Design a protein around this ligand. Structure first.
Ligand SMILES: Cc1nc2ccc(Cl)cc2c(Oc2ccccc2Cl)c1C(=O)O
Length: 135
């Protein structure tokens, strides 16, 4: 059968970024990692096997991989090496990813808009948008 996650499945490459440096500062990312991360053009591969969604991100300097069930909290190590407790849910057709660590929180929303995969990353007052297109 068809699922709301179907539209996300596939291989994606970064095409544009807005306010990523500010967002990384809010996360506590240091100067050098901000420079190196800002240069990268990651690929993200989203796949589904039964109820398990896998999201991989590959880049020149860092690869990440999470597998999860919607609504079930899990341990995640982020690209900037935060050790977080994460939960990912569907809100309509938007994947909502909340990461909690040291009493802090950031929310990452993934949505399909036109032929793009749009990521909205929010920490305190700062919103970054990262746009991906099919690879
Ligand atoms: C959502 C997201 N969050 C990030 C959080 C922190 C950093 Cl340093 C990179 C991030 C990042 O880029 C990367 C994610 C993995 C490897 C490399 C990069 Cl630059 C993404 C992203 O666009 O998927």
């Amino acid at each position: 059968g068809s699922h709301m996650c179907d539209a996300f499945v596939g291989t994606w490459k970064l095409v544009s970024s807005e306010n990523f440096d500010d967002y990384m500062k809010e996360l506590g990312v240091g100067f050098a990692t901000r420079k190196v991360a800002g240069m990268a053009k990651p690929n993200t591969i989203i796949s589904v096997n039964g109820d398990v969604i896998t999201l991989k991100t590959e880049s020149t300097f860092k690869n990440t991989e999470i597998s999860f069930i919607l609504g079930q909290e899990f341990d995640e190590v982020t690209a900037d090496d935060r050790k977080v407790k994460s939960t990912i849910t569907l809100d309509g057709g938007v994947l909502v990813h909340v990461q909690k660590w040291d009493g802090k929180s950031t929310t990452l929303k993934r949505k399909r808009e036109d032929d793009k995969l749009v990521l909205e990353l929010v920490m305190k007052g700062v919103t970054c948008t990262r746009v991906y297109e099919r690879a």
